[PDB]
Amino acid sequence: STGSATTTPIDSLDDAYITPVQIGTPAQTLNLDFDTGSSDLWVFSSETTASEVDGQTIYTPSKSTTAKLLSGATWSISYGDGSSSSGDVYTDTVSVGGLTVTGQAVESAKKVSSSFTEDSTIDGLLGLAFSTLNTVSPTQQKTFFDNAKASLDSPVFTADLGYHAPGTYNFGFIDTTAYTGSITYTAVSTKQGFWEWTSTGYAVGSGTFKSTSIDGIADTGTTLLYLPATVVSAYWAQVSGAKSSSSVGGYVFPCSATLPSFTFGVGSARIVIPGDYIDFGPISTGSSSCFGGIQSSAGIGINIFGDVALKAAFVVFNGATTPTLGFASK
Numbered sequence: 001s002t003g004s005a006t007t008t009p010i011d012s013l014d015d016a017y018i019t020p021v022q023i024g025t026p027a028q029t030l031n032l033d034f035d036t037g038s039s040d041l042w043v044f045s046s047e048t049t050a051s052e053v054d055g056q057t058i059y060t061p062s063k064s065t066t067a068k069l070l071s072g073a074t075w076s077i078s079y080g081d082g083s084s085s086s087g088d089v090y091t092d093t094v095s096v097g098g099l100t101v102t103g104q105a106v107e108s109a110k111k112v113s114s115s116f117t118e119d120s121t122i123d124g125l126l127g128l129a130f131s132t133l134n135t136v137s138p139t140q141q142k143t144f145f146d147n148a149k150a151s152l153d154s155p156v157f158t159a160d161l162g163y164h165a166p167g168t169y170n171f172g173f174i175d176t177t178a179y180t181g182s183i184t185y186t187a188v189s190t191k192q193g194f195w196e197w198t199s200t201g202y203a204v205g206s207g208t209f210k211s212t213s214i215d216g217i218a219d220t221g222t223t224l225l226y227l228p229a230t231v232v233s234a235y236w237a238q239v240s241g242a243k244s245s246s247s248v249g250g251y252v253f254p255c256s257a258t259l260p261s262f263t264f265g266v267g268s269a270r271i272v273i274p275g276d277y278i279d280f281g282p283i284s285t286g287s288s289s290c291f292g293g294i295q296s297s298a299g300i301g302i303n304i305f306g307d308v309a310l311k312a313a314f315v316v317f318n319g320a321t322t323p324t325l326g327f328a329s330k
């Protein structure tokens, strides 16, 4: 089998991407944030505290003839940005872009933090990291990808995120028309449950490439590119007037600036992030200070190749027995 679904930015800044997902019988379509940095599929639901729902589409398991309570199972997750959610669990039929999994754990939110409530366009998350990170207790549950894997033509999914435009998540096949040149594959460590890999270095604009190992994770659920402070300082030093602002929470730059590109290494290959991708606009409406798309990872504990990096590439998440990651230009 295969699946193919379009993923769409939630706003004009590409802050996140939503992908339609069919849950239950008859189908209830929810728009979920596909997140290669976590491993829970959870949704706003008829069980979510009423005051914490503001415009989201909810899953109502009582209206699904294939929904079954996973008795005794609960979940609770806290993300790196300080957001959180928790609840109980159903199993149900879940389809993404024509690919169907029966008996998928659908984690029903009873509680969500303010950041989720305030985002009316995101009806839940669909985790695509390794199932070892799944928070369901006392019986850990598998991701949609893990459940689908044996049935897929190939045990892979791909992320093809657009810049200020829709893109595509494919399951079970590699669309050879979707990228230019060749795909360069690189080793993955699953020791922390992430798609963790090591970039071979970086360049700023037309500058010389710096060969240096940068360990990080491929995370579609993170908006920006988080890299070591040395790297990030070298980038913003090429933008007149750019500075790190404690009050704002990162590097800002004059909105009148033209941003340089940023290149990162994948083995001997190079992925170029255009400067425009690194612009996240005025810090507040009408401000002439703009927020940077490359930020320091120093306060995170891990480097994160988020959407700013990933949208510059065609990315293969290879879930073979020994997983790997592939990057191509496009």
Ligand SMILES: CN(Cc1ccccc1)[C@H]1[C@@H]2OC[C@@H](O2)[C@@H](N)[C@@H]1O
Pocket: 016, 033, 035, 036, 037, 038, 079, 080, 081, 083, 115, 116, 119, 122, 219, 220, 221, 222, 223
């Ligand atoms: C749950 N977050 C997305 C989100 C979606 C909607 C509202 C608020 C936040 C992020 C969070 O920031 C980085 C990391 O954790 C990421 N893997 C996760 O997807």
